[PDB]
Ligand binder design. Structure first.
Ligand code: X6P
Ligand code: CL
Length: 242
């Protein structure tokens, strides 16, 4: 069941923004969104694609473990944090595209396509460059499809090893305190209109899990912090976090 709560739109209007937040109450098997239509609109995943990409690279042995160092190729890029060595944890933390492009090249088109089909991921279309299709290719996924994929990951039900799923969930760790744990991944799609920002993941509580997927229009990088801030405003309104 899906329920529409337009009162969350105030959190977007407050910041002259437009977007969608989708929540799923795992215990109750109930979903909530401010915009049912946009919740099912499929967009490029951009760096949220680092979740499946990590899973595939680990299961195929392209990445050995979360400590393997992927050395910087020496090309100075516009993101300072990318011009350094990384492991899986830091590469997800800083959304280090060039590390994941190398992964994708080693995975290859055929294994990439097969895995995404096995994951039931979005429209399963990797058309484009094997090392950029999640940024400017044919793959599309909606906020509700992100949640359905993440639920499989949470439960170790994806068709990769349990170990691979455990490592990626570790790498998704974003915030933890005495009240909740957030495992999540941001995205920023700039190469093809509409430019949007993503945040997808879940909130672990003592006795429930709330999955979330949000996206919002992002004409400039100035608003990127609104991805987390708006989501948290919704979570606070629903009393999921303090
Ligand atoms: C600052 N920036 C401009 C374009 C892309 C980025 C960027 C780099 C690293 C992480 C993130 C993020 O969304 O978390 C964004
Ligand atoms: Cl952890």
């Amino acid at each position: 069941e899906w329920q529409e709560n337009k009162s969350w739109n105030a959190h977007f209007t407050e910041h002259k923004s437009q977007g969608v937040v989708v929540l799923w109450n795992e215990n109750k098997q109930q979903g909530f969104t401010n915009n049912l239509k946009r919740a099912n609109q499929a967009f490029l995943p951009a760096s949220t694609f680092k979740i499946p990409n990590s899973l595939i690279a680990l299961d195929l042995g392209v990445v050995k473990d979360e400590h393997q160092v992927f050395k910087w190729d020496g090309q100075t890029r516009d993101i300072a944090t990318w011009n350094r060595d990384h492991n899986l944890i830091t590469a997800m933390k800083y959304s280090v595209v060039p590390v994941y492009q190398e992964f994708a090249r080693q995975i290859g088109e055929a294994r990439m396509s097969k895995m995404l089909h096995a994951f039931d991921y979005g429209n399963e279309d990797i058309s484009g460059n094997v090392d950029s299709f999640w940024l400017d290719g044919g793959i599309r996924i909606s906020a509700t499809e992100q949640i359905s994929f993440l639920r499989k990951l949470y439960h170790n039900k994806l068709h990769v090893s349990e170990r691979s799923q455990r490592i990626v969930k570790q790498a998704m760790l974003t915030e933890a305190n005495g009240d909740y744990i957030i495992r999540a991944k941001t995205g920023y799609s700039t190469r093809i209109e509409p430019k949007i920002g993503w945040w997808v993941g879940w909130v672990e509580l003592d006795d429930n899990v709330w999955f979330f997927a949000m996206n919002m229009d992002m004409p400039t990088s100035d608003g990127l912090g609104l991805r987390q801030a708006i989501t948290k405003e919704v979570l606070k309104q629903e009393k999921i976090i303090p």
